[PDB]
Design a protein around this ligand. Sequence first.
Ligand code: HEM
Ligand code: EJD
Ligand code: CL
Length: 393
Amino acid sequence: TIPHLAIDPFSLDFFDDPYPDQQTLRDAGPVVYLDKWNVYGVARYAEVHAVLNDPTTFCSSRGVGLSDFKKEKPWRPPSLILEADPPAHTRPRAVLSKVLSPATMKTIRDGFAAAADAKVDELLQRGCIDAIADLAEAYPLSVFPDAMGLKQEGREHLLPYAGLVFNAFGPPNELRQTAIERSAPHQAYVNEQCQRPNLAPGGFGACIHAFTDTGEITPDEAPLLVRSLLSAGLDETVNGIGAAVYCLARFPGELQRLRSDPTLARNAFEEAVRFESPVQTFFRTTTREVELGGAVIGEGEKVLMFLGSANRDPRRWSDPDLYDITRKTSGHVGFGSGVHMCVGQLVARLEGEVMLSALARKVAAIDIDGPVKRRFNNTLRGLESLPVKLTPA
Ligand code: HEM
Ligand SMILES: O=C(O)c1ccc(-c2ccsc2)cc1
Ligand SMILES: [Cl-]
């Protein structure tokens, strides 16, 4: 009653062009079985949204990667928020929600917008730039580590640790195993910076340690919570920003609309998060036998959610393969949905908005002038290189 498919969603062939295989997954049925890794798969919007919003049946405490924590040991101590279920998840989630609150955004918006304007001006002086290394990567590195309160030394570990974390959500393929092989230096840097003395006052990390006085987290819980903000946030925002630039270059009509109304910058980034979905997939584990879309799934089974596919499901979106900066994007699952829906989504939207705004006001044309190269990751979708010409407005 369940179609069995041989598609490997963690193969380089799939990473190169996942959209045809995603339709095959959506059109085979609401629930598929992937014989390659012995997991259930859901690629339609309705089933992805259903799973994300039933955390009791589809839990996260047994890991949101392929590995089942009841069967194998986690490659690192489990995150206190991503890899936790209610009620254990609730109080750590509330701390990160207050640390990255709408009120917190007010204290950092002017500095984030200034660095974005300054980077665009710098790149306009060069003309031909790599929109990944020089823009998508450079800008978040120039605002987020300082907003965390991280010292200057050792910041070169942040990007490799981010790519390791998301590679480790995948199956034990070469991408995952080679990432873990090289992980020891990045783990040691990240864990050390999580200690309260190493986090500058006023920053995100120091604000997490300050919540230990309230009874929501204990002092021994703070370093792991800080670790969450050194694991998530970086590569997703880089990939999302890089995808928005790529879209603005592939769809010149949308850049012209953004230039004419720079207040569309926020929705232009949100639509890029839907169009690209920097986080393509992750897992849940069933805690009981469950019927999902006419399919009986046993207890203790891994369920693979295709976020990017759900964001392009024609059963939910009109013209999903088109980048439309005025699209009603509310309801996309690029940030997830339910109790685990990205706690840093306000930081990501701010970073994306102020960068697209700086582009909207200072740039007249964005033209690809070189070979585009993909960056391969078991969980993340994004570009390795995007050579573009920036024409000043
Ligand atoms: C374009 C940018 C981003 C995307 C696409 C993204 C994506 C996601 C998704 C899909 C989830 C849900 C995971 C799940 O349900 O299992 C999530 C959770 C999370 N994200 Fe993001 N994220 C982004 C930016 C950020 C930023 C900037 C931060 C921190 C500053 C961050 C930190 C977190 C954390 C800590 C969680 C776990 C929340 C929880 O378990 O309740 N993310 N993210
Ligand atoms: O270290 C953490 O707490 C953490 C790590 C990864 C994610 C994430 C985001 C989209 S898929 C998985 C969330 C939180
Ligand atoms: Cl670690």
